[PDB]
Amino acid sequence: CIPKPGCCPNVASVPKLLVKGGVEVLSVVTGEDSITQIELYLNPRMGVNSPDLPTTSNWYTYTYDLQPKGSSPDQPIKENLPAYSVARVSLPMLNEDITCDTLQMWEAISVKTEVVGISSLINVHYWDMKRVHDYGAGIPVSGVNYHMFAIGGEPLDLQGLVLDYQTQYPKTTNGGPITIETVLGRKMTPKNQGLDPQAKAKLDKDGNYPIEVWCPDPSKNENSRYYGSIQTGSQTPTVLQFSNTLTTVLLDENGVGPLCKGDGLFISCADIVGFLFKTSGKMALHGLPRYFNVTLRKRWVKNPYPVVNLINSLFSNLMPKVSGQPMEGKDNQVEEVRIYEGSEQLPGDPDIVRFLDKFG
Amino acid sequence: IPKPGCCPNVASVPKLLVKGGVEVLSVVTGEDSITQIELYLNPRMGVNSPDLPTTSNWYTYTYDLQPKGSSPDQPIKENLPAYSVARVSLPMLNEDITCDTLQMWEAISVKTEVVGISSLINVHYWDMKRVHDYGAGIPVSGVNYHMFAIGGEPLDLQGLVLDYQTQYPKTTNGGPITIETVLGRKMTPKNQGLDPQAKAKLDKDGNYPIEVWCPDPSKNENSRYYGSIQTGSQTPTVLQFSNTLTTVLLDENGVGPLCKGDGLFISCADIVGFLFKTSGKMALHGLPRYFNVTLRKRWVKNPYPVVNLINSLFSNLMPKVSGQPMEGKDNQVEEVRIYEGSEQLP
Amino acid sequence: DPQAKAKLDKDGNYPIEVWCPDPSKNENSRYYGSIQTGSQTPTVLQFSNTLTT
Ligand SMILES: [Ca+2]
Ligand SMILES: [Ca+2]
Ligand SMILES: [Ca+2]
């Protein structure tokens, strides 16, 4: 009891939707050609990081009043240090094949993003705003802008750089932010005021890596895709775009996207929109959330790490350690290493040099 | 009886059938017809009508908005610019019940531009503030907020406010729709951030303030919205306009928005800048937008069963009944029997 | 106001600050425009004989 297919008018075809719902639907098993698409959001962390606090939640997505100390050295408080936002999405664990030494792994291909709440900025009638002139309206949110987001299978690697090492950031033992001297274990030097390879860290926590200290490391971030921009000025305007037709492709020059190591998706962002010119003349920054629409798929990859050697590390018996003289690092005690493979015709110099600069 | 060889070849352009006003929509067309609609949307800046002679002088403007200076804030409706919206009632179409398919409208492309850009060079408004002594008036400049949207269902909004302390006017019939109007409870500091619970659909015209509501990117799968902003005290207003520009509405899969309910929904809002008065006060200003939507007929498949579909209609046509109970609590039914087929007496 | 429309008849007699190209009716003509509104906002302009439209 079915109609003739030649009679039916042609109709286009589209990707078949199987499931739509909350995060619970990630535990659904799927075929190999399936495609998963996650929509989430991240509120900004501008020092005031929670509305549930009874006392000081009135300035959520804001910052306590910013102003220089006037006397060396600077001693800023946690609230005046905007920090990156970050979150992890626990993806479902996929299949693996031992006999081929291969395994599926989640790959991100495209993300759709836009800043939410842009239209809120036209509020020129906040009661404590600073009027541009007598009997006029206030000065809308404008000035400094720092926009940045990143997606990858690893936590975002990042580099440290400070405008002035003289600053004494709040101590970490209070559970607060993480500055450079927390990582290095020693006070910063003028080196840290420029680039310092010693100063590196991975984006572990939310609201604890101040933006004015840490910047994304372009070297190590190879399994992640980060985009950013800046705009610094007294009252420079806030220019922003938003639409749902813009899609950004995350694929690389090899045609592969970020690989979700550990069956986890790592997302991070931060958006500063400008100051809030209070009537008293004080200032305070403001931030807005971001909407993320990650498009994921399944890719087959070879297992790079030997299984047995891994578990061997976990046992003290099969991986004995010793607190001996240094054989790695700056003070290593290995004078030379030579690696031979195969055979060739006899060279005329056992002290082979490879650099023309070395002949002198 | 003409001679084909004698006559020169002429190009082939799409054939026009009918041209006119809204009454055109009632005509019947074929499967491959294409329809264009040209319309406009006046802005809504708190002053939302010219017909009332009491205060219509400040049409497309606000009432001299400025900060109070003392907590809390009690802004008035006429300082709350809101989105514009309208619905076009499209006609009914054909279907093929045998193949369980049918056709509904889709938007494929919209041509648009702002109207009245040229009127901004009026730097001689009699109460416009001079830039300096014996100078000329300060032109319309400052804050801008432009957006427009085309979709088959009304635009889905997201609520976010610069200050939850700001208490908005009570939602009197014909008033502004704010956060606490939706939730039924006073706002919390979360609303200064993102709150998934504070969502709403763009119901009415000129009642959804812009400084509160923003287009929800998740829920809006069936409409296309574009937007921009610049926030400056006196930053200039740059605007372009032409009729050669056209924006495609097709998605990744090559399908536009589908007009659910045989009607397309559109929304727009264009803040153009401040108006500086000699007294020093400041007020915003807007301009209309011209929309030229190109529509076609697309075949689609019915995903829902008919029996569940028809009862829904009956659910709406006949009113709910609050009668004596017949549910398991205190049922007033005492016995139920069911017979199926013949048999022998026990 | 759709009542207020008019064709561009004469020179020097149609104030810019009053009239704008009706988007709906100009279907047999191509028009391009811009604007820049400020007190002392600089004037940026470009010119060449290589570009065409
Ligand atoms: Ca590298
Ligand atoms: Ca969605
Ligand atoms: Ca026309």
Coordinates of N, CA and C and ligand atoms in Angstrom, one line a residue, chain A residues 39 291 293, chain B residues 217-221, ligand 2:
Chain A
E39 N 25.9 23.5 21.4 CA 25.7 24.9 21.6 C 25.8 25.2 23.0
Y291 N 28.4 33.0 22.6 CA 27.6 31.8 22.3 C 28.5 31.1 21.3
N293 N 28.9 27.4 18.9 CA 28.1 26.3 18.3 C 29.2 25.5 17.6
Chain B
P217 N 20.9 33.5 19.8 CA 21.5 32.7 18.7 C 21.2 31.3 18.7
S218 N 20.9 30.7 19.9 CA 20.6 29.3 19.8 C 19.2 29.0 19.2
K219 N 18.2 29.6 19.8 CA 16.9 29.2 19.4 C 16.5 29.7 18.0
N220 N 17.2 30.7 17.5 CA 16.9 31.2 16.1 C 17.4 30.4 15.0
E221 N 16.9 29.2 14.8 CA 17.4 28.4 13.7 C 16.6 28.7 12.5
Ligands
CA2 CA 20.3 26.2 17.8

